[PDB]
Amino acid sequence: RECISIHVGQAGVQIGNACWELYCLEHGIQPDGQMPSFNTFFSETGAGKHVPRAVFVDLEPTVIDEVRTGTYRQLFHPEQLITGKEDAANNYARGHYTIGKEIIDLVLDRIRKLADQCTGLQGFSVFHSFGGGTGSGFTSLLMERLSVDYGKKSKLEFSIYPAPQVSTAVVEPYNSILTTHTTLEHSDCAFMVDNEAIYDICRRNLDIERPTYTNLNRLIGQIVSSITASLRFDGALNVDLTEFQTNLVPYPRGHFPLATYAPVISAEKAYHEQLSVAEITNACFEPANQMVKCDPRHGKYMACCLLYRGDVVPKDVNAAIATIKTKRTIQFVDWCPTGFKVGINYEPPTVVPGGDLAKVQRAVCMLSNTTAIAEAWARLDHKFDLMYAKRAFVHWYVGEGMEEGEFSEAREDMAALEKDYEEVGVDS
Amino acid sequence: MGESNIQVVVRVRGQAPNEPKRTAPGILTTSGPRCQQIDVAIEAPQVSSSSAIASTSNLVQESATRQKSYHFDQVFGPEADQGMVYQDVVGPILEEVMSGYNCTIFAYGQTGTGKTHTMEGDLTSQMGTYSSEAGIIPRSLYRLFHTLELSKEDYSVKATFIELYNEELRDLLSIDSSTSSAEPSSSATATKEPQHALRMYDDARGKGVVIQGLEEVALKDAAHGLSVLRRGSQKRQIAATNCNEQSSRSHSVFTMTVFIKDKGSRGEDVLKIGKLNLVDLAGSENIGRSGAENKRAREAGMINQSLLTLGRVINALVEKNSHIPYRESKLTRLLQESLGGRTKTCIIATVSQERANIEETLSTLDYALRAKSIKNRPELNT
Amino acid sequence: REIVHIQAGQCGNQIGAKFWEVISDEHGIDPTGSYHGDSDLQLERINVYYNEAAGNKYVPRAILVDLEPGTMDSVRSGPFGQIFRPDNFVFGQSGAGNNWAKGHYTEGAELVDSVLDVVRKESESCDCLQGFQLTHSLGGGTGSGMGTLLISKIREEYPDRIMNTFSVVPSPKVSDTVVEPYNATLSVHQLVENTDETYCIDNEALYDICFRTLKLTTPTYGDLNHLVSATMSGVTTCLRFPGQLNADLRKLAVNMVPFPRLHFFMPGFAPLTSRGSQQYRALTVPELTQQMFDAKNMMAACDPRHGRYLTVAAVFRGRMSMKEVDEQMLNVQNKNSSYFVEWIPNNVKTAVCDIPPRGLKMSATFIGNSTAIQELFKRISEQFTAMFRRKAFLHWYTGEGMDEMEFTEAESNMNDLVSEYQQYQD
Ligand SMILES: CC(=O)O[C@H]1C(=O)[C@@]2(C)[C@H]([C@H](OC(=O)c3ccccc3)[C@]3(O)C[C@H](OC(=O)[C@H](O)[C@@H](NC(=O)c4ccccc4)c4ccccc4)C(C)=C1C3(C)C)[C@]1(OC(C)=O)CO[C@@H]1C[C@@H]2O
Ligand SMILES: Nc1nc2c(ncn2[C@@H]2O[C@H](COP(=O)(O)OP(=O)(O)OP(=O)(O)O)[C@@H](O)[C@H]2O)c(=O)[nH]1
Ligand SMILES: Nc1ncnc2c1ncn2[C@@H]1O[C@H](COP(=O)(O)OP(=O)(O)NP(=O)(O)O)[C@@H](O)[C@H]1O
Ligand SMILES: Nc1nc2c(ncn2[C@@H]2O[C@H](COP(=O)(O)OP(=O)(O)O)[C@@H](O)[C@H]2O)c(=O)[nH]1
Ligand SMILES: [Mg+2]
Ligand SMILES: [Mg+2]
């Protein structure tokens, strides 16, 4: 009845640095473990000073030394702070083959001591990136090796994914194609967030033009506490992870939702505004609030999962439910009859101290599905195909033993993936 | 400017005394997905066609048709003998290079596919092997003392064996007492001699030809002491992986030179010199499958790094663009004499037959597919 | 996690002598070698350049090589000389004649093993070998000869490492010697085939930098190299210091090298403002990126706008904001969309440190790679075409014993190199 975290990559670490600040904000947890009255991410000590059920992986000693010397070093345990020697240097090859088989016997070792503490484990989630070597090749190792020993649990992926316009390194599409096909081969459910539309929230919902990577990710961090952390907490209509298994994904292999968050209001705008249940549902379908550069109007909605926070009564919801059905500009599918599975919990989202978003009465995370990401998939593929036509940037991976035929293997099957988002509105 | 472009030949694995007892009982027989044919040399592998929600690779087919039918010049199967490959590949051009034509043999494919059984091979069941049947090297060395003797002309058996272990070139025909257990001094003395010049020659007589330092020539009267080529192949570096324990680790370049002289009826001697660049390469190691390790890793990657650079050439040969970069691998500079150069050269495409190794051959199957648009111009020596 | 340093030549020994001056002040260090800095991030990753010993001491992990005695003696006679430990001055008592065909050839060969032992004094005792940094010439002999024979043996001893060097491109403007188009010329026959990367710094632009754009009168060697010295330090800040998007040197080797021969690069320092222009300039994020377009801040003597850029890396310093960092980077990709190549959509690699050096508030480090940097090569290669026909002053070197075949093939080694940028230029 618990849940485990995996943080891979320089992106994947600093994600949790907000999230575990939030997770310790869930109970007033100081750097000791001060809390009354809960066993999801935590074990209890003999003094009762709780500790996370989380795994850190960093191939450099770079990022974690901030973590294990700065603030909130003591809530983690050096059992968990698994640091490494050398980066693979943004390489799917060495991140999967060379350096990856030097730490994996130590990382899988901490699992057998933590997962065995789980009295009937619900699931566990993996954090990585696409561009980072650490988040690419180690994903190729770990997510197959977990299914050797954990073939019957849940494997969530909150994976940071590049923009088709703003990019930070050359071989970023040259990573993700090699990773994702074997990822879809093994992983259960995968989220994707684009910094493109995250920047759009900074200018239009945050209205601040000097963000940090914390401020791009406390946004991502506030999502998860409403995805999962309240599912321990008792509300009206509480959901769990296992209510996504054959629910949200209508196929064996279609598991790609889309996360949005409706109340994103800077503290100046707390008063030219009077929030409601129906307003924030109207915020749920703005194509400028997709967190990925995509328009749902070019695609459809296969499914949609409404997961709510705070003071929420469904009679106020049910009006807004048929409203969006009536005010539809969505081109809804033929195959889903009506399915809007509902999540209603009790807890307000908490205010990040020194943070950004506002003290509200009610909040929404939404999962939906679209064929619009299949465009944004292929928009990265447009960046991907032309680098192969020069056969460029190729010596780092053939020099570390990865085949050209993998690129004919992965991308053509990735194109086969992208062609299989299009089978939604075919047969009718 | 010539149109003597290329030869494209294919032999595959099969009847090797560990192989057929498990494959053909396990999966379909001699070319299961692949459909071996001999006439127009057509062949086409596939996989299972299922209504796949994630459509697998090699789903390009329809009801009762073939796809990627890469029909070639000459393909062969497990049935093709050593002499039958010599009947088509090496034999009908070995009496053509006597006039002064030049050849080069090399292979390419997935690791452990039997490149060194084609190149080197090993002998047959004889108590005394009088240059008995093996790979392509001693069979030409058996025709060496035939067609340079039955022609009854003053010949010159000239050859030199050079290994290439990870961007070097090392002689293995040497006195090589320092490589064995010898006596060095207890302390090092001063180097009174100047620097040493090796391999660093390129001429502008023609182009593509590269002159080398210290060609230790080999001269034999028969195949009696021809185990110096086996003595040289003994020092060629191998290893024991798990994808193939038998497949070699290093890679070699062995040259051939036939200086034959006869005074023709015109009143001049015919100074005809041929070349047979007997070049073997290592296996293109998939290290996650084979399980290479720390020192083995740099021993493994430079093989593929060389084969990558070998792939970096042929795409530019068929491109017809300016300044094809032959200047990364020294093997390419050994190959730039004919890769876009002048004389003859054949290409061996030995690949796998596993259903798990269909996609892994497609990078080779693309390289044999592009293996026709390389232009040359033929000549002999007088 | 550690980097080994080599210096050679009358310049590259002198050039890095200014460099360790700066890295000593990078961490608040006594001229003896005691720590007195205050930043904890100074103290945390000392290891990469230093070898801390007992008595609370610090040893610059560096080997200083010359054939002239008094040059490195002047380093020792000068300040920041006692901060070394003197078991490292590996030299000889013979002049090389400022000759590549002697320093690579004879008088280095009685000094090779004495160098490589101090390598073996260090590199085995290192925790993890990561950097082989060199600083030398291409104009003289000692910067050109001995280092090529180092790389012929160091890579032989360390195939699984990384080879960078800061080699000084000759200036057709300002020089003093004659056979200058040999020393760089025969260096290329060994620099290309055995180094993973090198840069190309030429004084021919450096005089234009300090004099014009920095409002200075007299370009001294202590000041033209102090310009190089910051651009040295900016190569590997993320490997040394914390940062948001930290980048490896090998990462910098990955994204900046499309192809294993085209690996020549160019530095750039972003707050290149004069003394007087401090109180008349506002300092921003596009202020730093503005010099990416500047021809006068490209430290090698080429028009960047002449060719087209292949690859550009940007290594930043300061508490910035990525949205401003990305979109200002985005605009430069959108402002001049003919200046790049087409098949690489993201032409830029970002790199963001968290701490800039003291005194400033923003800094950066330009690392570009374009199809016009070959302009440095056509100047040298055509000078070779005159020296060979008469075989003019060949009678210093044939008595040594280097071959015309070397003069044939290393010549054509250049044409194989240069003529590949113009494949991808136009
Ligand atoms: C009023 C004042 O103090 O001003 C600054 C200063 O304003 C300027 C003018 C400095 C100044 O530099 C020069 O005048 C200069 C002249 C020729 C060649 C190179 C530099 C400065 O010397 C440079 C020096 O910079 C630093 O200390 C940096 O940390 C720098 N350190 C050194 O170079 C250094 C070395 C030995 C001893 C002391 C400092 C650094 C930069 C990058 C990487 C590592 C270190 C400082 C504070 C200044 C002056 C004094 C004017 C500039 O240079 C640097 C490297 O910062 C010139 O372009 C910048 C613009 C700066 O704003
Ligand atoms: N949203 C967001 N993305 C980040 C952040 N940091 C890094 N990234 C993304 O992560 C990608 C690189 O992945 P990293 O985690 O930094 O690198 P890595 O996984 O450690 O692997 P290496 O590249 O080998 O270092 C970049 O493309 C960034 O866009 C962050 O703080 N927030
Ligand atoms: N067409 C073939 N005819 C006969 N035997 C073959 C054939 N193809 C493969 N083999 C066998 O395949 C086995 C394994 O191949 P192997 O020769 O060990 O590796 P490899 O491909 O030659 N690599 P390398 O040694 O590095 O050149 C050998 O024992 C051969 O006998
Ligand atoms: N920046 C700079 N370049 C120098 C200096 N001294 C010499 N050079 C250049 O370096 C080249 C000569 O190499 P040098 O190191 O002096 O001779 P070597 O010791 O025989 O290698 C020429 O291009 C000189 O212009 C100096 O102090 N600073
Ligand atoms: Mg990483
Ligand atoms: Mg074989």
From TrEMBL, chain B:
Which residues are noted in the entry as Mg(2+)-binding?
A: G114, H117
Q: Which domain of life is it from?
A: Eukaryota
Start and end residues of each Kinesin motor domain:
5-374
| Localization (cell) | Cytoplasm, Cytoskeleton
Positions annotated to bind ATP:
G109, Q110, T111, G112, T113, G114, K115, T116
List where Low complexity composition bias occurs: 177-191
Q: Where is this region: Disordered?
A: 176-195
Q: Which family does it belong to?
A: Belongs to the TRAFAC class myosin-kinesin ATPase superfamily. Kinesin family. KIN-5/BimC subfamily.
What is the name attached to this protein's record? Kinesin motor domain-containing protein
- Region of the whole protein represented: 73 to 453 of 1203
